[PDB]
């Protein structure tokens, strides 16, 4: 039978409440196994189940470093989206990303994921072909355009097809 | 490993 891995990064900025809050949670099949919270005293990616404790310190290090970078990405794109939709500045908004991969019984990719939602509504998502994009409204139309131009689809596909699938396996053997 | 840093919106 098929298995899956899924990550959910969500950034939420609040009315004059400083920089947005960033969180990232990962799921293998349908169990949370890793998590990161910027609201933490010591922002770090940490194991949510015991079998993940069998990963080296180097693992948790770069995973955490990626998260810190991601925090900035959201911080910036939350702003570019304010523009796109012509909204205020002190306003309260949310921007989230969801990516992942399902694998078939043969352990090879079954479906790739990469998509974004702003303020609760769909924004843009990589289609099942990992080649084309679906753009919710007109603002998203702008992103789609540059992403089609820059070949974003191939960029994400690269990961979805191999790196992801490979790790989903690392984890599936771990427990 | 996570998905790489994403492109600009």
């Amino acid at each position: 039978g098929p298995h899956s891995m899924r990550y959910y990064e969500t950034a939420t900025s609040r009315r004059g409440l400083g920089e947005p809050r960033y969180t990232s949670v990962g799921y293998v099949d349908d169990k949370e196994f890793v998590r990161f919270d910027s609201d933490a005293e010591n922002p770090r990616y940490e194991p949510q189940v015991p079998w993940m404790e069998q990963e080296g310190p180097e693992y948790w290090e770069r995973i955490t470093q990626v998260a810190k970078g991601q925090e900035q990405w959201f911080r910036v794109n939350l702003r570019t989206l304010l523009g796109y939709y012509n909204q205020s500045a002190g306003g309260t908004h949310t921007l989230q990303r969801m990516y992942g991969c399902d694998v078939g019984s043969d352990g090879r990719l079954l479906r790739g994921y990469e998509q974004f939602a702003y303020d609760g509504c769909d924004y843009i998502a990589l289609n099942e072909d990992l080649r084309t994009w679906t753009a919710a409204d007109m603002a998203a139309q702008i992103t789609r355009r540059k992403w089609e131009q820059a070949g974003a689809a191939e960029y994400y596909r690269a990961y979805l097809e191999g790196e992801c699938v490979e790790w989903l396996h690392r984890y599936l053997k771990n427990g | 490993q996570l998905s790489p840093f994403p492109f600009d919106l």
Epitope: R75, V76, A150, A152, Y155, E161 | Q1
Partner: T-cell receptor, first 111, second 109 residues
Framework: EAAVTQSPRNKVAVTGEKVTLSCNQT?????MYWYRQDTGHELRLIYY???????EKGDIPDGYKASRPSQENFSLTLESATPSQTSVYFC?????????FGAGTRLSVLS | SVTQPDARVTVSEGASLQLRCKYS??????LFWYVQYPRQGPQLLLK??????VVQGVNGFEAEFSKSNSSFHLRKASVHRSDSAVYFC??????????FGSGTKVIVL
């Protein structure tokens, strides 16, 4: 990219001088970088930025300070020029994936 | 980390050119090739993300990605004087950061 313009192209500084290299990009890119190449060889990252307000140290940030006041402006500052900093500085912008470089800024430090 | 084994390479105008590039990088490899003409910044030649392992670039340049051989060698079937320059192989180390190779100087006769 003709969108990335550095200033100046040639600069000579005296030891101790506070030097500020300026970069401008009309690519509407969030990421901007400052590399240095000094043997026609490998370019090495000094500082980069995820977007306005972001300032991240590279592999050799010592003696350098950076500033991302806005979207299209990223400036590298040598607080106190030292001959170890004479090199060719390149600025780049990118919206994920491909990086686009400026013409370069040749900076020499006379003692 | 990316490695360009040859510091200098010389070819007879009209001949084929091949610049080797090996990469050691655990994560998803995002490889590129930049050319740097005298007194100028690096310019993108070609890049490889996924799909066709053989990518095409500007100026009759192409490269082939080989997960097995861990290479991303560059090639041009017929070089001209114009191609004399320094060629860089680069891998997106942690994206969005880019790590350059030591470069290779190409001299055409």
């Amino acid at each position: 990219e003709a969108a990335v313009t550095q200033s100046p192209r040639n600069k000579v500084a005296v030891t101790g001088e506070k030097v500020t290299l300026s970069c401008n990009q009309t690519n509407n890119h969030n990421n901007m970088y400052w590399y240095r190449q000094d043997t026609g060889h490998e370019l090495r990252l000094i500082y980069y930025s995820y977007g306005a307000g972001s300032t991240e140290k590279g592999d050799i940030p010592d003696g350098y300070k950076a500033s991302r006041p806005s979207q299209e402006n990223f400036s590298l500052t040598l607080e106190s020029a030292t001959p170890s900093q004479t090199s060719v500085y390149f600025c780049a912008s990118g919206g994920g994936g491909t990086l686009y470089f400026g013409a370069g800024t040749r900076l020499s430090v006379l003692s | 980390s990316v490695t360009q084994p040859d510091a200098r390479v010389t070819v007879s105008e009209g001949a084929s050119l091949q610049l080797r590039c090996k990469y050691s990088y655990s994560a998803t490899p995002y490889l590129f090739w930049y050319v740097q003409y005298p007194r100028q910044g690096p310019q993108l030649l070609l890049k490889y993300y996924s799909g066709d392992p053989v990518v095409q670039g500007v100026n009759g340049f192409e490269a082939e990605f080989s997960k097995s051989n861990s290479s991303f060698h560059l090639r041009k079937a017929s070089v001209h004087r114009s191609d004399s320059a320094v060629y860089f192989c680069a891998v997106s180390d942690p994206p969005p950061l880019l790590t350059f190779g030591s470069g290779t100087k190409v001299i055409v006769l």
